Design a protein around this ligand. Structure first.
Ligand SMILES: Nc1nc2c(ncn2[C@@H]2O[C@H](COP(=O)(O)OP(=O)(O)O)[C@@H](O)[C@H]2O)c(=O)[nH]1
Ligand SMILES: NC(=O)c1c(F)ccc(OCc2cccc(Cl)c2)c1F
Ligand SMILES: [K+]
Length: 307
């Protein structure tokens, strides 16, 4: 009876916004931690655990867009960060790259989590092009530092949100689409840990696919009716919001959930959709859950890594 301990850690403004909106949803058995220099924003966090970093350095303000201040702030507070991560088996570090606190502190937070043996996944945004080339260059250095500090990294270029809005779509509605990348990845692992599958996968399979593996994709597809299996598999690997596509994937963890009508043939169809993109020598871990509460709906979930 192994019950993996998951923690989601927001770092900086954007990261903690995403955590707050996640908490507004129904997320149980995940621990949320909020880390910021900005005391004003931190006080409005909904997370159980709040860590104000760098208070001596910033006097309670943010980092003023200076990543070196974010980095020093996280180092000043290393012990408080260690204490908050204690017990974690898996840590999601979420942050908006390009500012001061996220860019600088998020790699330190991820390094501490990995030092403590936790499976460490980064979920970060790149700035909009309209924020300017300098912010983009600063964010790019953050991404590289995250790569060197995490097991696996998911990068969401904010420019991709401009591909899914019309001219009137509210900004907050667009942000919720980016939030969903994190929410569905965390919820997917939670489901995998809690549910016993007819072909059962568990946290050790997640570790094999995600430990020290670079870029990652975490997707989910839901469909019904004819060709449901193919359509759900296509949805799970085709997010318009990710920087890393599934082409060339060297590891894949894949699960299909459906009712008692789930057929062997459609399991093959869904797996073939994913294989046709991945490397021919991909390490594929395939699972299946039969949820008789379901009727015609089928859910395909995919973790892809190794490029
Ligand atoms: N998608 C999304 N991006 C955000 C959000 N908040 C900030 N960003 C992006 O994150 C970058 C860093 O901003 P922020 O996190 O506030 O800076 P920091 O607190 O100094 O780390 C910005 O340049 C934006 O590109 C948010 O709520 N959603
Ligand atoms: N076969 C299982 O034990 C199982 C289960 F009983 C529930 C969920 C599972 O996978 C969820 C998942 C997979 C890939 C990506 C993501 Cl995000 C989520 C499973 F593999
Ligand atoms: K399971």
């Amino acid at each position: 009876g192994h019950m993996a301990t998951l923690k989601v850690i927001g770092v900086g403004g954007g990261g903690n916004n995403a955590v707050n909106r996640m908490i507004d949803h129904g997320m149980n058995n995940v621990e949320f931690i909020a880390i910021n220099t900005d005391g004003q924003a931190l006080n409005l966090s909904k997370a159980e655990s709040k860590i104000q970093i760098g208070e001596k350095l910033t006097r309670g303000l943010g980092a003023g867009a200076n990543p070196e201040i974010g980095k020093k702030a996280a180092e000043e507070s290393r012990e408080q960060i260690e204490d908050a991560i204690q017990g974690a088996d898996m840590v999601f570090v979420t942050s908006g790259m390009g500012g001061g606190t996220g860019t600088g502190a998020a790699p330190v937070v991820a390094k501490i989590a990995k030092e403590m043996g936790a499976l460490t996944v980064g979920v970060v945004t790149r700035p909009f092009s309209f924020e300017g080339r300098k912010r983009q260059t600063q964010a790019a250095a953050g991404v590289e530092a995250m790569k060197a500090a995490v097991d696996t990294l998911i990068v969401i270029p904010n420019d991709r949100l401009l591909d899914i809005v019309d001219k009137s779509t509210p900004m907050m509605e667009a942000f919720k689409e980016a939030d969903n990348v994190l929410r569905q990845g965390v919820q997917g692992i939670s489901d995998l840990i809690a549910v016993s599958g007819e072909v059962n996968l568990d946290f050790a399979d997640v570790k094999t696919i995600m430990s020290n593996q670079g870029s990652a994709l975490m997707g989910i597809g839901v469909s019904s009716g004819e060709n449901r299996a193919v359509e759900a598999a296509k949805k799970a690997i085709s997010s318009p919001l990710l920087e890393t596509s599934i082409v060339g994937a060297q590891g894949v963890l894949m699960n299909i959930t459906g009712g008692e009508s789930l057929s062997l043939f459609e399991a093959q169809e869904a797996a073939d959709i994913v294989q046709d993109a991945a490397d021919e020598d991909v390490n594929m871990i395939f699972g299946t859950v039969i949820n008789p509460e379901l009727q015609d709906e089928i859910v395909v979930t995919v973790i892809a890594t190794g490029f």
